[PDB]
Design an enzyme around this catalytic site. Structure first.
Site, PDB file in Angstrom:
ATOM      1  N   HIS A  40      57.516  38.879  51.829  1.00 47.54           N
ATOM      2  CA  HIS A  40      57.881  40.169  51.162  1.00 47.54           C
ATOM      3  C   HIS A  40      57.086  41.511  51.557  1.00 47.54           C
ATOM      4  CE1 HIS A  40      54.672  40.110  47.840  1.00 47.54           C
ATOM      5  NE2 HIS A  40      55.322  38.941  47.742  1.00 47.54           N
ATOM      6  N   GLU A  58      53.878  40.043  53.755  1.00 44.41           N
ATOM      7  CA  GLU A  58      53.078  38.912  53.685  1.00 44.41           C
ATOM      8  C   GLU A  58      53.848  37.630  53.318  1.00 44.41           C
ATOM      9  OE1 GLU A  58      51.966  38.236  49.516  1.00 44.41           O
ATOM     10  OE2 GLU A  58      51.933  40.441  49.323  1.00 44.41           O
ATOM     11  N   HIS A  92      43.888  36.032  47.321  1.00 39.62           N
ATOM     12  CA  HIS A  92      43.968  36.771  45.882  1.00 39.62           C
ATOM     13  C   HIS A  92      42.625  36.207  45.268  1.00 39.62           C
ATOM     14  CE1 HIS A  92      47.775  38.420  45.267  1.00 39.62           C
ATOM     15  NE2 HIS A  92      48.418  37.086  45.399  1.00 39.62           N
TER      16      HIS A  92
HETATM   17  N1  LIG Z   1      47.598  32.173  43.506  1.00 38.84           N
HETATM   18  C1  LIG Z   1      47.810  33.547  42.926  1.00 38.84           C
HETATM   19  N2  LIG Z   1      46.605  34.025  42.508  1.00 38.84           N
HETATM   20  C2  LIG Z   1      47.047  35.654  42.040  1.00 38.84           C
HETATM   21  N3  LIG Z   1      48.069  36.200  42.008  1.00 38.84           N
HETATM   22  C3  LIG Z   1      48.975  35.346  42.484  1.00 38.84           C
HETATM   23  C4  LIG Z   1      48.855  34.180  43.070  1.00 38.84           C
HETATM   24  N4  LIG Z   1      50.048  33.609  43.383  1.00 38.84           N
HETATM   25  C5  LIG Z   1      50.983  35.117  43.148  1.00 38.84           C
HETATM   26  N5  LIG Z   1      50.334  35.973  43.156  1.00 38.84           N
HETATM   27  C6  LIG Z   1      50.941  37.200  42.622  1.00 38.84           C
HETATM   28  O1  LIG Z   1      51.755  36.889  41.411  1.00 38.84           O
HETATM   29  C7  LIG Z   1      52.598  38.137  41.004  1.00 38.84           C
HETATM   30  C8  LIG Z   1      53.800  37.507  40.696  1.00 38.84           C
HETATM   31  O2  LIG Z   1      54.264  36.615  41.177  1.00 38.84           O
HETATM   32  C9  LIG Z   1      52.727  39.099  42.592  1.00 38.84           C
HETATM   33  O3  LIG Z   1      52.085  40.171  42.758  1.00 38.84           O
HETATM   34  C10 LIG Z   1      52.024  37.871  43.457  1.00 38.84           C
HETATM   35  O4  LIG Z   1      51.602  38.406  44.555  1.00 38.84           O
HETATM   36  P1  LIG Z   1      51.548  38.083  46.145  1.00 38.84           P
HETATM   37  O5  LIG Z   1      53.147  37.647  46.260  1.00 38.84           O
HETATM   38  O6  LIG Z   1      51.451  39.336  46.831  1.00 38.84           O
HETATM   39  O7  LIG Z   1      50.738  36.897  46.243  1.00 38.84           O
END
Ligand SMILES: Nc1ncnc2c1ncn2[C@@H]1O[C@H](CO)[C@@H](O)[C@H]1OP(=O)(O)O
Ligand SMILES: [Ca+2]
Length: 104
Positions: A40, A58, A92
């Site tokens: 996305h 990403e 993250h």
């Molecule tokens: N392991 C993880 N730790 C923190 N944020 C998470 C994560 N897995 C998914 N996300 C984030 O959760 C939110 C809702 O699914 C999205 O902003 C997603 O961001 P990303 O897709 O940029 O990783």
């Protein structure tokens, strides 16, 4: 030695290249995988110094070495642009909420 370290995860340049290839192919196909629909768009509100231009996208990179196929994406990501150029590896892990820090 790791070419990129995301928290406690170690990635070689081959692991980056393999995940980038997979994610770019889904981008070209107009397809996504996973509850969170990867790949996305990525917005660089944290201001990382990426030396390639956006748009950015990403795609999860897995510590296991497997290509992401749905299921938990973990916390690490490869960022690539519209010309299939690598922008960086972020995570993250160690960032509040859904924000990111770069892998080192
Ligand atoms: N392991 C993880 N730790 C923190 N944020 C998470 C994560 N897995 C998914 N996300 C984030 O959760 C939110 C809702 O699914 C999205 O902003 C997603 O961001 P990303 O897709 O940029 O990783
Ligand atoms: Ca590996």
């Amino acid at each position: 030695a790791c070419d990129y370290t995301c928290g406690s995860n170690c990635y070689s340049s081959s692991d980056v290249s393999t995940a980038q290839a997979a994610g770019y192919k889904l981008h070209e196909d107009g397809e996504t995988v996973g509850s969170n629909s990867y790949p996305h768009k990525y917005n660089n509100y944290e201001g990382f110094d990426f030396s390639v231009s956006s748009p950015y996208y990403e795609w999860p990179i897995l510590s296991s070495g497997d290509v992401y196929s749905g299921g938990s994406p973990g916390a690490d990501r490869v960022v690539f642009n519209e010309n299939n150029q690598l922008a960086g590896v972020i995570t993250h892990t160690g960032a509040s909420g859904n924000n990111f820090v770069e892998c080192t």
